[PDB]
Every structure is written in structure tokens, then in C-alpha cells.
Amino acid sequence: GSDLGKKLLEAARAGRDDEVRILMANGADVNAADVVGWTPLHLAAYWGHLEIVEVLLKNGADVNAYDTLGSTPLHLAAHFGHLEIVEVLLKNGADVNAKDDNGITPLHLAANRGHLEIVEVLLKYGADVNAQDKFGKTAFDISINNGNEDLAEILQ
């Protein structure tokens, strides 16, 4: 639709904090999606740009936008160990139990990558510890398979 939409995806992508103010001010669609269904909030979440995440939520960015495979900005922040972004998304209403097309939750992804500080925050906000993916696997199962005892301790 909008040319500013596209430019907003690109600046959120590349971490350009100032260009994201200027494009919002000028009416850029904060929920503009690229071809894989990633919004500025996804891009900012994946590349760990805290300030951009904050600027976008403040301008009405959809906190639970999903991509063409069912994955939400929280999924991405959780998987790439961006703690402070995980806290911000969860404060702005991110669905802590959002499942993607595979039935994967942010807890599964945090757990698989051994991001402990994030696993705690997710459980804090009501993450379901017994949530199964399409194969039957829980975050606990993931801990046993990766032989990460520290993470196993936390999920009993």
C-alpha cells in the first residue's frame, strides 16, 4: 500500500532509530508487513532494537502480529535472547502462550537456546510449562534432550 510502509520495514530492520520517528510522524503504517509477513515490530524484535520496539508499540503496533508461519515478535525476541524486548512485549500485552504453525511457543524457543533469564520472565507472565508442540515436546523435554541441567532445575 504505502511507500512509507516499505521504508518503515527497512529502517526497523536496519536499526535506524531516528528515521523511524520521522516515518511514523508522516503516517507510515506501523503494521506494514513485508513478504514473509514480518512487521516492523518483528524486525525490531529479531535484531534486538529496544528503542524501536518501544517507539512502535507506543504508536499502536499490533503486539501479536503473526507472520505467514504463525510466529509473533515475542517468539523472535525470546529465541534471540533479547531480554529487555521480551519484558516490553509482555508488558504491552504479548500473548505469552502464542503458538506458531508448528505449535512452538516462546518458552520452547527460549528453552532450546538456553536463555534462562527469559524462561523466568516467560513463566512469570503465565507461560504454560506443559504446552506441547506438534511432536509432543515440552520445554522440559527440550531441557533433557539438550542436557542443560540449569534449565531442567528451573522447570522441576
Partner: protein, 578 residues
């Protein structure tokens, strides 16, 4: 200019990291004991291509260089994947450029670029190769391959997979030694002696179509043509070229070291004149470049397709053929090619000007033409389009020295580029020479589920690879000329993530299992073009001195900026800056 040798290899269906880590690294690690080497650089990309360029000291003999490189590469061949060995790994002197580029076009709408490339390969290239003064000749295209385009719905209908297709083609498009009757040592007094002739290579689509995949239990036959469409086609489809809007192939012809340019060019034109009476209808020869050609760059965004790029090139062509009809002879539009990156989202238009003497006055010279073009093309949305004609610039390599990984080296690269922009006083246009990461589709195979179901992981991986990437199976004989046979999915079954689940694999117990039962996927970013420098991961950075500053002064700041990067990040100067 220092002599350079380029190693070119190809891994069909391979991503940049797969190519780098199974080919590029392995070849780099064997580039020892070669005399007079200054430095080595390489690119590994999403089209399955690696190019390794070795640059030697000035006054090194280029043949000795070529041969030493080639012998090292050839000893490392068994360390490479079979699929790469079978495409051929070429080692060529790359520092000399073209004597001429010859376009072969079709004007009466009866031939595709693949049809034209086959004609050129089988009727023209070799006679041009043996012409007086000619060195290397590069075919811009290939000879035909026999293309088998598989349909997953019909494959599953008959409990078959691509593995079965591949197995059946190796078995039924074959030619082996069968021996003789009465061969030596014989029973003494033998009169009959005769070769035994068994299976011979297949020759046509008809014959591939009758390949028997299996006899059903009710006694009906599944033939290859029941699970696939069958055509002669290209080996590869990454590039689409037009000459003034018409399908085109070409030849890139180099002058043999020591030979005469003008005599060689005339000798080539003469030889192409001999061939013109034998051409099929509407085939014509053009000479877009021959010892005032300029170029137009086209770059579309991340994830943009061939068709979208084509549209833009078509606007570029129409601009030159209408708005510069007085000044432009031709536009040769090459979709899928660039100099700093191949890919569906790039292309390049080679624009041949009419003779100097037919473009009077400054308006109609290259420089004013290119500015006008750039002004007009800057109002194309969804693409960057730059007209340009081919002691001020510099060439910097940022280097991963401590195993940092691509993600961290990118972050260091951004730190350097962000700092260089805070000094517009000293520096201008400081930028990556390469490409940015882009969305890629990550599919994880679940080993537990595949074992529980009795689905073999080679069946899984061959099914995925062969369908979505294509596979070179073996060779056939087309009109007496040996050529390749490729299997791959028909286009409409390998386009989108949903198509993944239409592909079935046969388990140990004969049940058909869809890809979705043992796989999961997600979007992530990664590199469509990995770079290396002296065998370490690298990112090339170009730039120039701000007005009224020396290149030496610009370098000094770049070095000083480079000293403040994260631990483990180094640099080197290369090219013009070495």
C-alpha cells in the same frame, strides 16, 4: 595489473553457507605451496556458486600460476561433494577481459533462449574456439538438458518418490559394457566374434517418458510421463537475457595471449559469416561489444523475484529504445546477473551506443545520456536503477580473526560504517560492496519422528533437494551429442511454504508420509553471499576521500576507526589500495 586466477565451482540447489562450508573452505585450505601469491578472496552465494580469485605479484607468469593453482585444486577434488565434482571446477586466468561479446538472437518469435543456447553450443562455439587468435570462449547459456519436471500428487498417487524416479533413470537411461561372443581367450577354432550391445543411452523425451517406474498389483504400468512433464530445456534458469526485447544467447570471446586483436576480430566475423547460410529462420548475429557501451544497474529489494526484476528491465529497455532512439543501437538486458551479486533481484542492462559520429553535440555524448537516464529512472519505485560508464577510491576488507561468526562480523561492520558517516569531512560513500542478509526459510527435520515412522533421512533429504533444488542424474545423447539429465519439481509444486506438505516420502513399511509429519519451519535471516579474504571470513567495504582530501588521508582515518572495533576484528587493504 597483477595477474589473477579464478576457481569457479557450482553446487546446484545450495545455499551460501552450504557452498562455503563444503567447497570454499576446503579449497582455500588446500591453496598452499603456490609461488608468488599476494592474496586470495572468495564469494559463496545463494545460487550455489563459489568464485575464488587468487592474485599474484606483478611479473609472475600467469600460466605457471594457473597450473600451480589447478594442481592443488585437483588434489583436493575428492574432498568436495560429488555434486560439485560433477559440475566441473574450472581454474582460469581471469585478469584479461573480452575481445568481443557476440549476441545470438531470434527475431521471428520461434525460439527461446534455451533453444538458441543449444544451437550455439552444438553448431557455433567450437568452430569459434578454433578460430585464429581466439583464447577462451564462454557460452552465456548452456546446451540442452533433458528436464524431468516431477508432480508430487501423481508421485504419491502411485506410492513413489523422487528417489524412485532417480533410481529408475539410472537404471533405464544406461549404457554399460556387455562384452562379446567368442571373445578372447576363446575356444580354439571359434568362428563367431561379435560385440554384445545391451542398453544404450536414451535419445528423446518420448524415450524418457516410457521409463517404467513400476507395475501395479492389478497389472497396470506407471511410466515416467505419468508422474512428470518431459522437455528439453536449460541446465539452469537463473538468468534471462533479451537483446532489444528478443530472446538471446551469446558468446564472450577472449584474445589468445600474444595474438592480434584486429586480425582476430575479423577472423571471428568471417567465421560467423560462413555459418549464416546454415542458420534456422530468424537467427541473427549481433556485436554489442567489439575491440562506447555503458551499463544500467538494476537492484530490487530482499526477496524480490525474477519476474519483478524483469518488469523493471523492460521499463529500462523501453526508455532507451524510445527516449534515446537517436543515440542507442541496442540494449542487452541480463536478468539475474550483477557484478557484486547474482540473484533473482538483480540485473544489468548493457547499452550499446551508435557511432560517435552519429551523435553530434554534447547532448548526445555518453555523459549527458547517463545523467538523463539516472534522473528518469530515479522515479521508479521498488527498485534502485543507476546508469553509469565504467586514483580516488579505496578497498577495505574487514576480517573475522577470532572465529566470531557472520552475525558478529556484521555488527562490527555496522559500527565501522556508522563511524565513517560521522566524518563526512574526510570520507564519502563508505559502504559494503556485498549484500545484506535476507529472509530465509528454515526447515528442521525431526529425527525422532522420522525414526518412529521408518522414514529414512536420505529419502527425506533427496526428496527435498531433488524436488526443490534439482538434481543432475546422469547423461543422455541428444542428436549424437552427450548432454545432461536433470530431475526437479514442476514449478507450481515448489513455490511456497504450503507446497512442502504436498511432498510425500515412502517409509520402510510402504506407507506414504507427508513432509509435515516430521518437519517444522520458520523464517530467519541469513546471508545470500558470504565473503572471505585470505581464507578468513570477510566483508568488503568501498569508499572515497571527501573533496579536497588525499586517498592516503582517508585511509589513515579508516585505519584509526578500524582500531576501535570489537575484539577479534581486523582489516586489510586490497585491490587498488594494496
Amino acid at each position: 595489473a597483477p595477474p589473477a586466477v579464478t576457481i569457479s565451482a557450482s553446487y546446484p540447489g545450495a545455499d551460501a553457507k552450504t557452498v562455503q562450508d563444503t567447497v570454499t573452505q576446503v579449497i582455500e585450505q588446500n591453496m598452499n605451496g603456490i609461488d608468488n601469491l599476494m592474496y586470495m578472496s572468495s564469494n559463496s552465494d545463494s545460487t550455489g556458486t563459489v568464485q575464488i580469485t587468487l592474485t599474484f605479484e606483478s611479473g609472475t607468469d600467469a600460466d605457471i600460476a594457473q597450473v600451480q593453482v589447478q594442481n592443488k585444486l585437483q588434489l583436493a577434488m575428492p574432498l568436495l561433494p560429488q555434486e560439485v565434482q560433477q559440475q566441473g571446477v574450472s581454474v582460469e586466468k581471469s585478469s584479461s577481459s573480452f575481445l568481443m561479446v557476440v549476441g545470438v538472437i531470434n527475431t521471428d518469435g520461434t525460439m527461446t533462449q534455451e533453444d538458441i543456447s543449444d544451437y550455439v553450443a552444438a553448431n557455433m562455439k567450437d568452430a569459434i574456439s578454433r578460430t585464429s587468435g581466439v583464447g577462451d570462449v564462454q557460452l552465456f547459456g548452456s546446451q540442452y538438458a533433458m528436464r524431468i519436471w516431477m508432480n508430487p500428487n501423481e508421485l504419491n498417487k502411485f506410492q513413489l518418490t523422487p528417489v524412485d524416479v532417480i533410481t529408475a533413470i539410472k537404471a533405464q537411461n544406461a549404457q554399460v559394457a556387455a562384452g562379446q561372443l567368442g571373445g578372447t581367450p576363446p575356444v580354439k577354432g571359434q568362428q563367431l566374434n561379435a560385440s554384445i550391445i545391451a542398453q544404450t543411452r536414451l535419445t528423446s523425451t518420448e524415450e524418457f517418458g516410457k521409463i517404467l517406474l513400476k507395475v501395479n498389483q492389478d497389472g497396470s504400468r506407471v511410466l515416467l510421463r505419468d508422474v512428470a512433464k518431459i522437455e528439453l530445456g536449460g541446465e539452469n534458469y537463473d538468468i534471462i537475457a533479451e537483446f532489444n526485447g528478443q530472446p538471446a544467447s551469446g558468446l564472450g570471446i577472449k584474445l589468445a595471449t600474444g595474438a592480434n586483436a584486429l586480425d582476430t576480430a575479423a577472423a571471428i566475423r568471417a567465421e560467423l559469416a560462413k555459418m549464416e547460410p546454415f542458420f534456422p529462420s530468424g537467427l541473427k548475429i549481433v556485436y554489442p561489444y567489439d575491440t562506447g557501451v555503458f551499463m544500467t544497474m538494476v537492484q530490487l529489494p530482499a526477496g524480490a523475484t525474477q519476474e519483478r526484476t524483469q518488469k523493471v528491465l523492460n521499463e529500462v529497455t523501453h526508455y532507451y529504445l524510445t527516449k534515446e532512439k537517436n543515440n542507442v543501437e541496442s540494449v542487452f538486458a541480463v536478468n539475474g546477473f550483477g557484478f557484486a551479486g547474482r540473484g533473482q533481484n538483480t540485473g544489468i542492462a548493457f547499452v550499446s551506443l551508435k557511432d560517435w559520429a552519429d551523435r553530434p553535440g554534447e547532448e548526445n555524448k555518453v555523459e549527458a545520456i547517463t545523467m538523463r537516464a539516472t534522473r528518469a529512472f530515479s522515479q521508479i519505485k521498488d527498485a534502485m536503477v543507476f546508469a553509469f560508464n565504467l586514483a580516488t577510491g579505496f578497498d577495505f576488507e574487514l576480517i573475522d580473526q577470532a572465529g566470531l561468526g557472520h552475525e558478529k562480523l556484521t555488527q562490527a561492520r555496522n559500527q565501522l560504517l556508522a563511524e565513517a558517516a560521522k566524518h563526512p569531512d574526510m570520507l564519502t560513500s563508505v559502504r559494503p560492496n556485498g549484500l545484506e542478509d535476507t529472509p530465509q526459510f528454515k526447515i528442521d527435520i525431526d529425527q525422532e519422528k522420522a525414526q518412529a515412522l521408518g522414514v529414512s533421512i536420505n529419502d527425506i533429504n533427496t526428496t527435498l533437494g531433488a524436488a526443490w533444488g534439482g538434481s543432475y542424474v546422469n547423461d543422455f545423447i541428444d542428436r549424437g551429442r552427450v548432454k545432461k539429465v536433470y530431475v526437479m519439481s514442476e514449478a507450481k509444486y515448489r513455490m511456497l511454504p504450503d507446497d512442502i506438505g504436498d511432498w510425500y516420502v515412502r517409509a520402510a513399511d510402504g506407507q506414504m508420509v507427508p513432509f509435515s509429519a516430521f518437519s517444522s519451519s520458520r523464517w530467519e535471516y541469513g546471508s545470500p553471499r558470504l565473503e572471505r579474504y585470505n581464507g578468513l571470513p570477510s566483508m568488503e567495504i568501498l569508499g572515497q576521500a571527501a573533496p579536497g582530501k588525499s586517498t592516503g588521508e582517508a585511509m589513515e582515518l579508516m585505519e584509526q576507526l578500524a582500531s576501535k572495533l570489537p575484539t577479534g576484528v581486523g582489516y586489510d587493504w586490497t585491490g587498488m589500495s594494496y
